Enzyme design. Sequence first.
Site, PDB file in Angstrom:
ATOM      1  N   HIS A 144       0.800  -1.216   0.000  1.00  0.00           N
ATOM      2  CA  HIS A 144       0.000   0.000   0.000  1.00  0.00           C
ATOM      3  C   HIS A 144       0.848   1.288   0.000  1.00  0.00           C
ATOM      4  O   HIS A 144       0.575   2.225  -0.753  1.00  0.00           O
ATOM      5  CB  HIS A 144      -0.948  -0.009   1.210  1.00  0.00           C
ATOM      6  CG  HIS A 144      -1.915   1.130   1.221  1.00  0.00           C
ATOM      7  ND1 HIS A 144      -3.093   1.112   0.509  1.00  0.00           N
ATOM      8  CD2 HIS A 144      -1.870   2.331   1.843  1.00  0.00           C
ATOM      9  CE1 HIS A 144      -3.739   2.248   0.700  1.00  0.00           C
ATOM     10  NE2 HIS A 144      -3.022   3.000   1.513  1.00  0.00           N
ATOM     11  N   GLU A 145       1.866   1.349   0.849  1.00  0.00           N
ATOM     12  CA  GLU A 145       2.669   2.580   0.957  1.00  0.00           C
ATOM     13  C   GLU A 145       3.518   2.819  -0.285  1.00  0.00           C
ATOM     14  O   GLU A 145       3.646   3.949  -0.752  1.00  0.00           O
ATOM     15  CB  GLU A 145       3.548   2.570   2.208  1.00  0.00           C
ATOM     16  CG  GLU A 145       2.747   2.522   3.536  1.00  0.00           C
ATOM     17  CD  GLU A 145       1.598   3.557   3.593  1.00  0.00           C
ATOM     18  OE1 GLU A 145       1.776   4.696   3.113  1.00  0.00           O
ATOM     19  OE2 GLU A 145       0.510   3.234   4.124  1.00  0.00           O
TER      20      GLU A 145
ATOM     21  N   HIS B 182       1.846   4.672  -2.868  1.00  0.00           N
ATOM     22  CA  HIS B 182       1.954   6.117  -2.684  1.00  0.00           C
ATOM     23  C   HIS B 182       3.312   6.647  -3.140  1.00  0.00           C
ATOM     24  O   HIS B 182       3.391   7.680  -3.814  1.00  0.00           O
ATOM     25  CB  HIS B 182       1.725   6.496  -1.218  1.00  0.00           C
ATOM     26  CG  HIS B 182       0.304   6.364  -0.773  1.00  0.00           C
ATOM     27  ND1 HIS B 182      -0.749   6.941  -1.455  1.00  0.00           N
ATOM     28  CD2 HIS B 182      -0.238   5.740   0.297  1.00  0.00           C
ATOM     29  CE1 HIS B 182      -1.880   6.678  -0.821  1.00  0.00           C
ATOM     30  NE2 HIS B 182      -1.598   5.950   0.246  1.00  0.00           N
TER      31      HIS B 182
ATOM     32  N   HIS C 175      -5.512   7.120  -3.371  1.00  0.00           N
ATOM     33  CA  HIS C 175      -6.390   6.051  -2.925  1.00  0.00           C
ATOM     34  C   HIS C 175      -7.384   5.625  -3.989  1.00  0.00           C
ATOM     35  O   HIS C 175      -7.652   6.354  -4.935  1.00  0.00           O
ATOM     36  CB  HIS C 175      -7.083   6.444  -1.620  1.00  0.00           C
ATOM     37  CG  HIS C 175      -6.167   6.389  -0.440  1.00  0.00           C
ATOM     38  ND1 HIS C 175      -6.229   7.284   0.605  1.00  0.00           N
ATOM     39  CD2 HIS C 175      -5.138   5.554  -0.159  1.00  0.00           C
ATOM     40  CE1 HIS C 175      -5.292   6.989   1.490  1.00  0.00           C
ATOM     41  NE2 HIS C 175      -4.615   5.945   1.047  1.00  0.00           N
TER      42      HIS C 175
END
Lengths: 159, 159
Positions: free
Chosen positions: B114-115, B118, B124
Amino acid sequence: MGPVWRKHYITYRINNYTPDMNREDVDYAIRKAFQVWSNVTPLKFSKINTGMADILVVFARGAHGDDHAFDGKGGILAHAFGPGSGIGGDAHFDEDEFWTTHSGGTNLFLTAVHEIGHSLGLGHSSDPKAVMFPTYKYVDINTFRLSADDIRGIQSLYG
Amino acid sequence: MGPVWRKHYITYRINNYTPDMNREDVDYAIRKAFQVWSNVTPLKFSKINTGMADILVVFARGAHGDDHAFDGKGGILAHAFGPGSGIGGDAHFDEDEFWTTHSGGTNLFLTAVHEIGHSLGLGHSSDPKAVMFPTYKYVDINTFRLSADDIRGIQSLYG
Ligand SMILES: CC(C)[C@H](C(=O)NO)N(CCNC(=O)c1cccc(C(=O)NCCN([C@@H](C(=O)NO)C(C)C)S(=O)(=O)c2ccc(-c3ccccc3)cc2)c1)S(=O)(=O)c1ccc(-c2ccccc2)cc1
Ligand SMILES: [Ca+2]
Ligand SMILES: [Ca+2]
Ligand SMILES: [Ca+2]
Ligand SMILES: [Ca+2]
Ligand SMILES: [Ca+2]
Ligand SMILES: [Ca+2]
Ligand SMILES: [Zn+2]
Ligand SMILES: [Zn+2]
Ligand SMILES: [Zn+2]
Ligand SMILES: [Zn+2]
């Protein structure tokens, strides 16, 4: 604003109960959660055991009839619909979560406060101190307070 | 559009290790997390143990020098900055979380996937199936897959 309830006397009904908790505990958590919001607004909330309430409280798992299926243990905990007729205002809790009076599961009180905020017309807050911030964090029920941003949010909808 | 990496050989360095895991289970989880994204992009990721890297991986707790303090156990899990020099790309994991190779904690591998999303420029996703959907759910690492949405998003930033 988006939608709001155009009345101040709002009823809820607990549709069904989670087996994770005593029935008395579930009633209490739900009642306190509404009290959090009636404490800072003109709104009055009243529990109804018959007839149709404005805000139905439901425990369900997976696909449960509304185009927003739950996801098994963890992940999405709960959802609620904004003010409106029919399913509007209703709060749904993922029965695949383990609901608890305190911590060590998913605290039902805290989640109900978050969800009722939705039922009353709030969206999410960018402020991590706010109960409307969209991450679950346990805080002791006795020490829990709405944040400045929560109150500002709800008072802008209902005075 | 938000920034992207201009080059294709991207480096990461692990700044400090969480004591919650073996040092090498952390390397493994991080390495596998990068592999998820290099599999669907032209990007290649290399770990370095000294010198300046593009993505610094940090475990910190509370306020740690970037205006986005962590909040103790629970709640926020981690955060990461989009592509760019300096702090850009860096990925910070909340040390107050309990990091695990599997479940019984917050899975480091899934959270790092997930990170890194980014770090590579992604925001998102509103698709619950997406790993960029901002809600944690444990899934066995062997069964985890990027969703169509995630891949679509990343393939539309890189070529
Ligand atoms: C699907 C919705 C309808 C539903 C809900 O609202 N029902 O009312 N969920 C919320 C899902 N999230 C959002 O809708 C949303 C929308 C816009 C932004 C965000 C957001 O930024 N969330 C936090 C993400 N965090 C960070 C992050 O994004 N790092 O990259 C930072 C930047 C704050 S995080 O640290 O919490 C985080 C979250 C997930 C992962 C992740 C994802 C996939 C795999 C591995 C890890 C990693 C970090 C979330 S929900 O998860 O059922 C939910 C969440 C919290 C509560 C609640 C809140 C207070 C008290 C008691 C309970 C209740 C329910
Ligand atoms: Ca769930
Ligand atoms: Ca209703
Ligand atoms: Ca349950
Ligand atoms: Ca950097
Ligand atoms: Ca935290
Ligand atoms: Ca820790
Ligand atoms: Zn539902
Ligand atoms: Zn919410
Ligand atoms: Zn940080
Ligand atoms: Zn995120």
